[PDB]
Amino acid sequence: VEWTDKERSIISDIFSHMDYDDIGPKALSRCLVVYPWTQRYFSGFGNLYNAEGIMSNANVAAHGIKVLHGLDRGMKNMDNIADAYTDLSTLHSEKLHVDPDNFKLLSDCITIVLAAKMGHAFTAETQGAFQKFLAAVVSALGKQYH
């Protein structure tokens, strides 16, 4: 993946205005409800969902903040995405046994939660650069799956 300057500006702009403490938790909370099989990796935290069926565990949800900071790295050096995520890839695959498809599902959740917050500032071209970035990180995260 190469990057135009406009894409670099868009992604930098998205992350500077992003409240990770809000976006992050909402996105993982949403993914655990829309793609419920993902709760398999947090099941041991216990006390995951509401009587009402919402994934109310702030602790588990707070992993979404770490995801977003995990995204910082690709964002900091977009010319090095693939090498940027080897230890993280190694970890989700070898220690966490996380299905890589789940990276796609969470990305989708991130995009939609971001969409809700930015509203009409989340233009087609913004969604475009942001999806393209997420894609590249996702791919890099599935590299150490052997």
């Binding site: 409800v33 989708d108 939609i112 509203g119 989340f122």
Partner: protein
């Protein structure tokens, strides 16, 4: 398949946002074509394949009209969308793989437009619904 919970969820959401279906469709089609430009091949017979072009705006109303019809036929989407399926399958020959791309764009638009309405719970049922929509639209293809 959609549960009675899913159907109520989708009818209640639509009940709330259907008023904006023209803008939701304009916006959803624009996003698809910009974020997934390979889909523009199916629209290359239009003179303006640009976001919010008059062709895009007009077609956006039809798409969401089809989505209004799918809510109305939510209990039997195969039968409900049979004519739309035949259209896309034999007249237009659209690769059915593209349906989930527009569906994703519809979810993005609704979130931008109705953030407080488009809850995790609304999202899971609409996702299941849009997935049933794609499946019914694929009916007549092979």
């Amino acid at each position: 398949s959609l549960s009675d919970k899913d159907k109520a969820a989708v009818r209640a959401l639509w009940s709330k946002i259907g008023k904006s279906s023209d803008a939701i469709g304009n916006d959803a089609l624009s996003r698809m074509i910009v974020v997934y430009p390979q889909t523009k091949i199916y629209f290359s017979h239009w003179p303006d394949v640009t976001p919010g072009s008059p062709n895009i705006k007009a077609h956006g109303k039809k798409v969401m009209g089809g989505i209004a019809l799918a809510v109305s036929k939510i209990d039997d989407l195969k039968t409900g969308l049979m004519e739309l399926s035949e259209q896309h399958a034999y007249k237009l020959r659209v690769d059915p793989s593209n349906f989930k791309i527009l569906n994703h764009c519809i979810l993005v638009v609704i979130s931008t437009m109705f953030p407080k309405e488009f809850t995790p719970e609304a999202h899971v049922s609409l996702d299941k619904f849009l997935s049933g929509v794609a499946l019914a639209l694929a009916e007549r293809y092979r």
